[PDB]
């Protein structure tokens, strides 16, 4: 078996994967320090969920890189086969190599469900490094959810303004007969860190950034960064039910 993983609670995996579920297919990376699931869309967007090996009660890989593509929606349906309102549900994940299916052993109350998901052969790499990040903002996630689940979707773009000057941090939408602005002062108690060196105004397709709301709702803190190119990086610090910290990343190209 190339990959062997086990959880006392499936929700430490399924919950995080739901935050990137906006394509029915997902590439899975499994290395020595955890599992990385990746979904992409129209070559501008990439969402990565990182569940480190420390989360699992048991985790073993030997080939230092085992990669496969699966149906993320089928995977999620299987992982939540015992109900989305549970009384835990254990998991044993098993994948042993190319051409062979992803095995899922879910148990609850002695009831055992066995899933066999077939795998295909698998990606974008946005060279987003910290050495060329221009603007960075860290925000308290909770005080921000209300708003971005409420951002105008009739607009085609989401315009993000970051600046050392007023209005400091601004999300703007442009629907029909409606210009809408969302402003956050660097003074705010929601601002945990404000490091904007240069005034930058970028535009991103709203349909591409909308699923990030799922990650935001789960997160307690969110990191927002832009670089010279204008590429966006959204990092969501997520605390699972075991108090452990996992991470979801969103990259997006400009318009």
């Amino acid at each position: 078996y190339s990959l062997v993983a086990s959880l006392d609670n499936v929700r430490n995996l399924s919950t995080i994967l739901k935050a990137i579920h906006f394509r029915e297919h997902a590439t899975c990376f499994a290395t020595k320090n955890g599992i990385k699931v990746t979904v992409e869309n129209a070559k501008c967007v990439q969402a990565n969920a990182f569940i480190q090996a420390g989360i699992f009660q048991e985790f073993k890989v030997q080939e230092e890189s085992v990669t496969f593509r699966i149906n993320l929606t089928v995977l999620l349906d299987c992982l939540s086969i015992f109900g989305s309102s549970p009384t835990l549900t254990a998991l044993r994940m098993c994948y042993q190599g190319y051409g062979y299916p992803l095995m899922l052993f879910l148990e609850e109350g002695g009831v055992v469900t066995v899933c066999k998901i077939n795998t295909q052969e698998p990606t974008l790499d946005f060279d987003f490094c910290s050495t060329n990040v221009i603007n960075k903002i860290i925000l308290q996630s909770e005080g921000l959810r209300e708003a971005f689940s409420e951002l105008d979707m009739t607009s085609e773009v989401l315009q993000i303004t970051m600046s050392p000057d007023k209005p400091y941090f601004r999300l703007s939408t442009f629907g029909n007969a409606g210009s809408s602005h969302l402003d956050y002062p660097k003074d705010s108690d929601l601002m945990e860190a404000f490091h904007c060196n240069q005034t930058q105004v970028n535009r991103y397709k709203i349909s591409l950034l909308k699923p990030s709301t799922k990650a935001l709702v789960l997160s307690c803190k969110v990191s927002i960064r832009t670089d010279n190119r204008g590429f966006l990086s959204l990092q969501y610090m997520i605390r699972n039910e075991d108090g452990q910290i996992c991470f979801v990343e969103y990259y997006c190209c400009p318009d």
């Binding site: 320090n33 910290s130 990040v133 990092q235």
Partner: peptide, 10 residues
């Protein structure tokens, strides 16, 4: 590659 979390402050 794994994630490089940029959440360090204070």
């Amino acid at each position: 590659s794994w994630v490089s979390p940029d959440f360090d402050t204070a």
